[PDB]
Amino acid sequence: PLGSTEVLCLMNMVLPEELLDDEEYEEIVEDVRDECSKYGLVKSIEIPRPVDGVEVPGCGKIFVEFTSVFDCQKAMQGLTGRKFANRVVVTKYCDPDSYHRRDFW
């Protein structure tokens, strides 16, 4: 949305293929958590995954809810421009209301 919010969206981090395996998925989760935990006390994480061939929304995106707007804003500044499995990490803010209602985008 317009400006800063307490929800961070990491994009271009994974492809649906990586998320199929439970072993790899659980790992991707804690990796994101631990990294964000450096600015953390993060409220929650959401990484939607097929469920193919449904193509559920927000798939290929990683959402991280922080406790505060400040925290989140610092997380993006630090995480944006970094690599993840050699992929460029792209970032933005998400509407926290949309996020709570599980309307992931």
Binding site: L2, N12, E27, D31, E35, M76, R82, A85
Partner: protein, 101 residues
């Protein structure tokens, strides 16, 4: 872990973009990185064969040269992802000139 520690497109998504315009930005940006990685080419091959997946049975040509090397396989995926992304914007075009690469 998985994370990375140490002149492309801005890594932060500009302010107001439609669900589509945003998708175009991120795709256009990956097209950018993929092109770079294949030019250098900066693949994602791990230095040691410990974290690597088991290798497939090797196949060779008439000179005895292996065809399905790690590098070849990995360069394939990148070319594949880049193709699909490029092809994704084929059913988009705002008169966006194809590179033909």
């Amino acid at each position: 872990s998985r994370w990375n520690q140490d002149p492309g497109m801005p890594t932060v998504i500009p302010p107001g973009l439609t669900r589509e315009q945003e998708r175009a930005y991120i795709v256009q940006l990956q097209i950018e990185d993929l092109t770079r990685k294949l030019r250098t080419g900066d693949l994602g091959i791990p230095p040691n064969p410990e974290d690597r997946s088991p290798s497939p049975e090797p196949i060779y040509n008439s000179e005895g040269k292996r065809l399905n090397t790690r590098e070849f396989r990995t360069r394939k995926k990148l070319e594949e992802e880049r193709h699909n992304l490029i092809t994704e914007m084929v059913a988009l075009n705002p008169d966006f000139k194809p590179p033909a690469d």
